[PDB]
Design a protein around this ligand. Structure first.
Ligand code: C2E
Ligand code: C2E
Ligand code: C2E
Lengths: 297, 296, 297, 297, 297, 296
C-alpha cells in the first residue's frame, strides 16, 4: 500500500525493478517512469509525487563522469534526492548508492545505503511508518494541537473537578471515557456536516467543561456525550483544516473522485489517528480513558 | 531583515558578492560560506538553513564538465532541489548563466538568467506578502482558526445578533472582534499569556448561542469586553506552533537563540498575514475583525 | 538487556562477533556496524549511541601503522574511545587492546584489557551495573537531591517530633513507613498528572511535616499518606525534570513511541530507584522505614 | 576569566601561543603543557580538565603519517578531541584543522575550523557563553526542575487564586512578585543553613500556595515571603544537590580552599542563574514577576 | 578474610600462588594481578590497595641485575614495598626475600624474611592483627581520644563523686556499668541519626556528670543511661569522624554499595572496639564496669 | 621554616645543592646526607624523616644500568614510594631526568623533569594551604571537632537563640565563638590549660538547649563569657594529638626535642588551618567563629 517513489537514471532500469521486487507486496513501489503525467513539466510531476509518495528510495550510480575524473551520481537523481529530502526528510527519503558512486560533497560522512541492504532499508521503512513528524499537510501538528488543547485539557478538567456543565446545571462524572471519532472520509466543506449528522444520529447531548472563578481567563470546552458514566464522543473539527490544506497541497483543475487525493486524505487521517493514539498512551490523565475510532462510516 | 540563503560553488565567489550588493541592504542574505555551523555535517546545516532561510537564489554556472555537457556542480543542484522541496518553487530560485545545460528535469522551466537580480528582488517582494503551506503550520493554523473560529463566530453573531453567558442571552447591537497575537510565543503555549491578558482587562466569558434546531453543533466560548461588544481573543492554536517549532528545530540548548526567535516571529507574522488577508476574503469578517499583531 | 556498544575497525569484524559471543545473553550487544543510522553523519550516530549505550567495549588492534614505526590503534577507534570515555567514564567505557597495539601516549600506565579477558570484563560490568554515578541525565543527582531534601528530611522530622500536620490539626505518628512510588512510565508533561491520578485513586490524605517556631527558616514538607500508623506514599516530582532533560538529551524530530527513549527513560527510572534504595540502606533514620516501589502501573 | 583547554602536539607549540594571543586576554586559555598535574597520569588529569575547562579548541595538524599514506594528526589530539566532545559537547569543543590533515572518517564531512579563524571561534565561544547545555553535574537540569516544579507552579498558583494560605488564614495577594536568591558560595551542608540564616535576618514568613479541594492529589508549596504586595523570595534548595554532585564530579582527598572547586562551583551557580533568568522570560506568568538576585552575601 | 596484598614481579607468578596456598583460609589473599582496576593508573591502583589491603607480603627475588654485578630486587617490587611500608609500617608490611636478592643499601642490617618462613610470617600477622596503631583512618586515635576524654573521664568522675546530674537534680550511683555500643554500620551523616534512634527506642534518660565549683574550668559529660544501678549506654559520636575521613580516604566517583569501603569501615569499627577493649583492661577505674558492644543492629 | 626531605643518590650530589638553592632560603631543605641519625639504621631514620619532613623532592637519575634499562637507584625509588605512602601523591615529588625509565608502576604518570624546581616550589606553596589526612589525626580531629561541636553548637544557638545554665534559659541576642588553640601541647592534654584559662577569665559553663522532642540528643556544655555572649573554648580533642604524637614518634628520652616541638606545632597549625577553612565552608559558622591560634 505505502507509496514509495523509486527514482533512478534511465539506464538503471533493471536495478529499479529488482528493488521493486525486493520489497514486493504491502508497498506500492512507483518508479519514476510511470510517475510522469502527460502534458506536464518534469519538475511539476516530481514535486507532485513528492506530495504523494510516502517515502523515496532514489538510486545513485556510476554515471556522469564529472570534473573538479570522478564517477558521480546523476544530476537528475541528485536533484530528485535533494527535493524529496527537503520535502520529506532523511527519516523518509533514502539514497541507495553502489560501491563507489562519489556522493556530492554535501553528502559526505553521511552513511547512505550501499540485497540485504534493501532488507534493512525496508525494516527502517516500517520503523518510520510508526512515526509521525511534521509535514506540509499538518496532520501531525493538528493532532498535537487537538490533544494539547482539547483532549488533554478536557481529560484533566474532568479528572480534576468531578463535573461537566450541561445547560448550566452540573452533572457529576463518576466514570469517564471519551471516544475520538475520525471520519472515514473528509467532506469538501470540512467535518461540520458529518459532525452534525453523527451527533444527531446518537443522543450525544451537548455539555461543556465546568470552570471556576479561581481562574478568570480559562476557556470552556463544549462537547457531546452520552454519578453518571459518560461516553464522551468527539469528532475533531481540526480535520477541516486538513481538507483546506489539501486544496493548497495539490491544487486540482478538475472536479471528480481523485484517487491520489483520496489516498492522501486517508493517509492524513491515518497519521492523525496514529498521533492521537500515541499522545493518549503518553499522559496518565488520558491513558485508558480516551479511545480512538478510525475509519468511521 | 529578510533571510536569504545564497548558495554557489566554492570557486564562484565574486558573483556572490555582486548579487549580495544587488539584492540590496534591507534584506539579510546569508552566504553558504558562513551558513555551515561548526561541528555539524554539511547536509545537516543545509537542512537547518532551509528551516531558517526564507528564500533561495542559488547560482548555477559552468563549473564541472561532464559526460560534453558543461553542467553546474552537483552540490549546487542538490541544494537547489533541497530548497525547492523544502520551501517551494517561488521561495527558491536558480540563477543560471547563458549556457549551463541544467538537469533535464529542469528543462523547459523558467530559470533566471544585475537587472536579473533586481527582477528576482521584485519577485521576492511579491512572495513576501503571499503565504505558502509550511512544514510548521503557520498558514494552515491560520486557515483553521479563521474557518473554525473567526468566520464561525462572526457568522453566528451576525445571525442571532445575540451571545450567551451563564444562560443570559445578551443582545449584540454592534459586533466586531480582535485577534490578539502575542509578541513572543510562550513556552507552555499561549495559555498563560491568555490568562494574564484576560485577567488584566475585563474580558468576560461568553458563548455563541446555539439554536435548538442544530442539535449537533457546539458553541464557541470566547472572551469579550443591545450593546457594543468589544470582542477579542488570543488564538489558542498558537500553542501548536510552539510544539511544531521543536519538531521543526530540535536543539539540546536552553537559552536565548536568535535563529529560533527569528523563526518563531516569522511564523507569527505569517499567521497574522494569512488572517488579515482572509478577513478581507469574507463579508461577515470585514471591518468586524482586526489584528493586533505583536501585543506586549 | 543492557546495551553495549562494541566499536572496532571494519577489518576487525570477527573479533567483534566473538566478543558478542563471549558475553552473549542478558546483554544487548550492539556493534558499530548497526549503530549508524541512515542519512546521518557518522559523528552524529556515534554521539547518539553514546547517549544510549550503557557501556562500551571498544576494540583497539594493530592497524594504522603510524610515524613519530609503531603499530598504533585506529583513529576511528581512538576517537570513539575518547568520546565514550568522556561521556560515560572509565567505570563504564572499556578498551580491549591486543598484545602490542601501541596505545596513545595519553593512555600510558593505564591497565587496559588485554577470552578470559572478556570474562573479567563481564564481571566488572556486572559490578558497575550495581553502581550509579553522575550522567547527562541527572537520575543519580536527582535521586540524591530527592533523598537529601525530602526523604531524609521527612524521615528525620517525623522521627524527631512525633507528629504530622494535617489541615493545621496535628496527628501523632506511632508507627512510620513511607513508600516511594516510581511510575512505570513517565509522561511528557512530567509526573503531576500521574501523581494526581494516583493520589485520588487511593485515599492519600494530604498532610505536611510539623514545623516549630524554634527554627524560623525551616521549610515544611507536604506529602500524602494513609497514635496512628501512617502509610506515607510519595511519587517523586523530581522525575519530571528527567522527562524534561530527556528532551534535551535526545532531541527528536518525530512524534511516536520510540524504543530508544523508552529504554533510556526506563533505565533512568531504574537508576533513580537504585540510588534511592542505596540511600535508604544508608541512614538509620530511613533504614527499614522507607520502601521503594518500582515499575508502578 | 573563562577557562579554555587548548590542546595540541608536543611538536606543535608556537601555534599554541598564536592561538592563545588571538583568543585574547579576557579569557584564561590554559595550555595542555601545564594541564598535566604532577603525580597523576595523563588520562586522569585530562578528565579533570574536562571537568574544569569550559570550552576546547584542540589543534589537528600534519603530525603523524599513517597507513589506512595519510597525514593524520596525532592519536593523542584526536583522543583528546573525542574525550572533550563526549564530555562537553559538539559546540563546547572545536577542532582547528589545517588545509590537509585527513581527520578520522568519523569526522569526515563535518565542519572543522580551518587569525580570522580564531576570532570566528571566539565569537562562537561568546555565543555558547549565554546558552546552557545539559551537564554531568546538573546545573541546567536543576534549574529546569526548579522552574517547572516551583517557580512556574508558584507563579501560576498565585496568579490563579491571587491568595496564599498561612496557618489557615487566606491572605490576599493584590500584587505578586518573587526573587530567586542564589548564594554567592555553596554551603557545605547545602543551602539549608544559609536559607535559615537569611530567613532569620529578614522577616521572611512561611506561606503555602492555596490548594482548592477539587485537586485532591496536589500538594502546596510552602515558601518564605515578605490584598497586599508580597515581596516573595526564596533560595532554591535544589542547590544542595549541586554540592553532592560536585564531589561526584571532582572527588579529592584534600580539605581546604581549592581554586578549581571555587571556579567550578561558581560557574555552576552562574549557569543555574542564567538558565532560570532565561526561563522566566520564557513564560508570561513568570515575566516581570520574578527576578534573580545572583551572588547574595 | 584479612586482605593481604602479595606483590611480586610478573615472572614470579608461581611463588605468588604458592604463598597463597601456604597461608590459605581466614585471609583474603589478593595478588597484584587482580589488584589493578581497569582504566586506572598503576600507581593509583597500588595506592588504592595500600588503602585497602591490611598487610603485604611483597616478594623480592633475583631480577633486575643492576650496576654499581649484583642481582637486586625489582624496581616495581621495591617501589611497592616502599609504598606499603610507608603507609602501613613494618608491623604490617613484610618483604619475603630469597637467598641472595641484594636488598637496597637502605634495607641493610634489617632482618627480612628468607615454607616455614611463611609459617612464622603468619604468626606475626596474627600478632599484629591483635595490635592497633595509628593510620590514615584515625580509628585508633579516635578511640584513644574517646577513652581519655569521655570513658575514662566519666568513669573517674562517677567513681569519685557518687552522683550524676539529671535535670539539675542529682541521683546516686550505687552500682556503675556503661556499655559502649558500636553500630554495625556507619551512616554518611555520622552516628547522630543512629544515636537518636537507639536512645529513643530505649528509655536512656539523659543525665550528665556532676561538676563542682572547686574546679571552675571542668567540663560536664552528658550521656544516656537506664542508690540506683545505672546501665549507662553510649554510642561514640567520634565515629562520625571516621565516616568523614573515609570520604577523604577513598574518594569515590560513584554512588552505590561499595564492598571495598564496606569492608574498610567494618574494619575501622573493629579496630575502634579493639582499642577500646584494650583501654578498658588498662585502668582500674574502668576495669569491669565498661563493656564494648560490637556489630550492633 | 618548612622542612623538606631531599633525597638522592650518593653520586648525585651537587644536583642536591643546586635544588636546595633553587628551592630558596625561606624553607629548610634537609638533605638525606645529614638525615641519617647516629646509632640508627637507615630505614628507621628514613621513617623518622617521613614522620618529620613535610614534603619530598627526591631526584631520580641515570644511576644503575639494568636488563629488562637505565633506572635510578633502588634506594631512590624505595624512598620515593615510602614517602608517597607516608605523605601522599602531592606531598612527595620525583625529579627525573629526560631518560631514567622509571618503574612501570610509575609509567604514564607526571614526574617533574631550574624552572622545574621553582614550579615544584609553587606547588609546595599550594599544598601548604591545603590539608591531607595524616597518620596522626590533625585534620581528622579538626573535622570531628567542627562537625561534632562547632557546627553543632552554632546551629543550636542560631536555632533556639537561647542557652541554658543551671536551668536558667538565658537569651542569646548576639552570638559568636572563639577557638583557643594553645601555643604548646600540654603533656596531660589541654585539660589543665583549659582549667587555667577558664579560671583566668570569667568563663562560665552553659549548655545548648535541648528541646523535649529530640529525646536521644545530648547538649554541649561549654564555657562562655538577650545578651552578647563572648563564647570561646579550647578544643579538648587536642589531648588526643598528644597521645598520637608518641604513637607517631616514640622515644625513650625526656627533654626538649626540636623534632617533636616542630611536629606538634605543625599539627596545631594544621588543625587551626582546617578549622579556619571549615568555618568559611559553612554559613552558620561564618563570621560567628574565629580562631585565636597560639594563645599563651
Ligand atoms: N469539542 C470541542 N473541541 C475543541 C474545543 N477547542 C478545541 N477543540 C479542538 O482542538 C482543536 C485545536 O484547538 P486549538 O489548538 O486550541 O486552536 C483553535 C482555537 O484557537 C480556536 N477555537 C476553536 N474552537 C474554539 C472555541 O470554542 N472558543 C474559542 N475562544 N476559540 C476556539 O480555533 C483553533 C482551531 O480550532 P479547530 O479547527 O476547530 O480544532 C480544534 C478543535 O478540533 C472545544 O471547546 N470543544
Ligand atoms: N512531597 C514533597 N516532596 C518534596 C518537597 N520538597 C522537595 N520534594 C521533593 O525533593 C525533590 C528535590 O527537592 P529539592 O532538591 O530541595 O529542590 C526543589 C526545591 O528547591 C524547589 N521546591 C520544590 N518544592 C518546593 C516547596 O514546596 N517550597 C519551596 N520553597 N521550594 C520547593 O524545587 C526543587 C525541585 O523540586 P522537584 O522537581 O519537585 O523535586 C523535589 C521533590 O520531588 C515537599 O515539600 N513535599
Ligand atoms: N556522650 C558524650 N560523649 C563525649 C563527650 N565528650 C566527648 N565525648 C566523646 O569523646 C570523643 C572525643 O572527645 P574529645 O577528644 O575531647 O574532642 C571533642 C571536643 O573537643 C569537642 N566536643 C565534643 N563534645 C563537646 C561538648 O559537649 N562540649 C564542649 N565544650 N566540647 C565538645 O569535639 C571533639 C570531638 O568530639 P566527637 O567527634 O563527638 O567525639 C567525642 C565524643 O565521642 C560528652 O560530653 N558526652
Amino acid at each position: 500500500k505505502k507509496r514509495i517513489f523509486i527514482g533512478s537514471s534511465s539506464e538503471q532500469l533493471t536495478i529499479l525493478n529488482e528493488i521493486v521486487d525486493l520489497l514486493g507486496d504491502d508497498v506500492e513501489c512507483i518508479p519514476w517512469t510511470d510517475a510522469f503525467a502527460l502534458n506536464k513539466s518534469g519538475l511539476d510531476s516530481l514535486i507532485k509525487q513528492t506530495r504523494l509518495a510516502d517515502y523515496s528510495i532514489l538510486i545513485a550510480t556510476k554515471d556522469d563522469l564529472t570534473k573538479q575524473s570522478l564517477t558521480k551520481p546523476r544530476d537528475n537523481v541528485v536533484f530528485e534526492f535533494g527535493l524529496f529530502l527537503g520535502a520529506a526528510g532523511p527519516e523518509k527519503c533514502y539514497l541507495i548508492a553502489e560501491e563507489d558512486t562519489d556522493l556530492p560533497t554535501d553528502l559526505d560522512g553521511i552513511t547512505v545505503a550501499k540485497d540485504k541492504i534493501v532488507e534493512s532499508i525496508r525494516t527502517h521503512l516500517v520503523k518510520i511508518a510508526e512515526m509521525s513528524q511534521l509535514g506540509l499537510l499538518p496532520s501531525t501538528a493538528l493532532a498535537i494541537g487537538y490533544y494539547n488543547s482539547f483532549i488533554k485539557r478536557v481529560c484533566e478538567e474532568i479528572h480534576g473537578s468531578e463535573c461537566v456543565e450541561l445547560e448550566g446545571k452540573k452533572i457529576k462524572v463518576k466514570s469517564f471515557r471519551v471516544d475520538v471519532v475520525i471520519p472515514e472520509t473528509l467532506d469538501d466543506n470540512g467535518v461540520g456536516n458529518f459532525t452534525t449528522l453523527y451527533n444527531k444520529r446518537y443522543g450525544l447531548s451537548k455539555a461543556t467543561t465546568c470552570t471556576n472563578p479561581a481562574l478568570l481567563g480559562t476557556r470552556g470546552f463544549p462537547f457531546h456525550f452520552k454519578p453518571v458514566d459518560i461516553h464522551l464522543l468527539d469528532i475533531p473539527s481540526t480535520l477541516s483544516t486538513i481538507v483546506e490544506s489539501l486544496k493548497l497541497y495539490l491544487p486540482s483543475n478538475q472536479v471528480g473522485q481523485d484517487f491520489d487525493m483520496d489516498y492522501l486524505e486517508m493517509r492524513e487521517l491515518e497519521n492523525f489517528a496514529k498521533v492521537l493514539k500515541y499522545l493518549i498512551g503518553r499522559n496518565a490523565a488520558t491513558k485508558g480513558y480516551v479511545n480512538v475510532l478510525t475509519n468511521v462510516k
